[PDB]
Amino acid sequence: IVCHTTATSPISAVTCPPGENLCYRKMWCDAFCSSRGKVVELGCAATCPSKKPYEEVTCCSTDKCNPHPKQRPG
C-alpha cells in the first residue's frame, strides 16, 4: 500500500507494503497546538501504532488514505 510519509519535505506518498498494510496520520497536541504545536506523523505500518487514546491515529489500508490535515481534514 502507498502511504503518506512525514519523512519527506514536502510530506509525500511512499510505496510501503513489506511491513505495511496500513497508512496513518498519528497527530496529537504537544503543548497547546493552536499556537504551541501539533506532532503530526504521516507513516506506514502493518499495525495502528502509538496510543490512539490521546493520539489521532487515523489508520487506513488503502493508497494515499492517510492525508496530512491540510490536504483533506483542513
From Swiss-Prot:
Residues of the full protein shown: 22 to 95 of 95
Source species of the chain: Bungarus multicinctus (Many-banded krait)
Job of this protein: Binds with high affinity to muscular (tested on Torpedo marmorata, Kd=0.4 nM) and neuronal (tested on chimeric alpha-7/CHRNA7, Kd=0.95 nM) nicotinic acetylcholine receptor (nAChR) and inhibits acetylcholine from binding to the receptor, thereby impairing neuromuscular and neuronal transmission. It also shows an activity on GABA(A) receptors. It antagonises GABA-activated currents with high potency when tested on primary hippocampal neurons.
GO cellular component terms listed in the entry, alphabetical order: extracellular region
Disulfide linkage: C3-C23, C16-C44, C29-C33, C48-C59, C60-C65
Tissue specificity: Expressed by the venom gland.
Annotated keywords: Acetylcholine receptor inhibiting toxin, Disulfide bond, Ion channel impairing toxin, Neurotoxin, Postsynaptic neurotoxin, Secreted, Signal, Toxin
Name used for this protein in its record: Alpha-bungarotoxin
Subunit organization: Monomer in solution, homodimer in crystal state.
Molecular function as annotated in GO: acetylcholine receptor inhibitor activity; ion channel regulator activity; toxin activity
Keyword Amino-acid biosynthesis applies: no
Family: Belongs to the three-finger toxin family. Long-chain subfamily. Type II alpha-neurotoxin sub-subfamily.
Localization (cell): Secreted
Miscellaneous comment: Is identical to Alpha-bungarotoxin (A31) from B.candidus (AC Q7T3J2).
UniProt main location, coarse: secreted
Origin superkingdom: Eukaryota
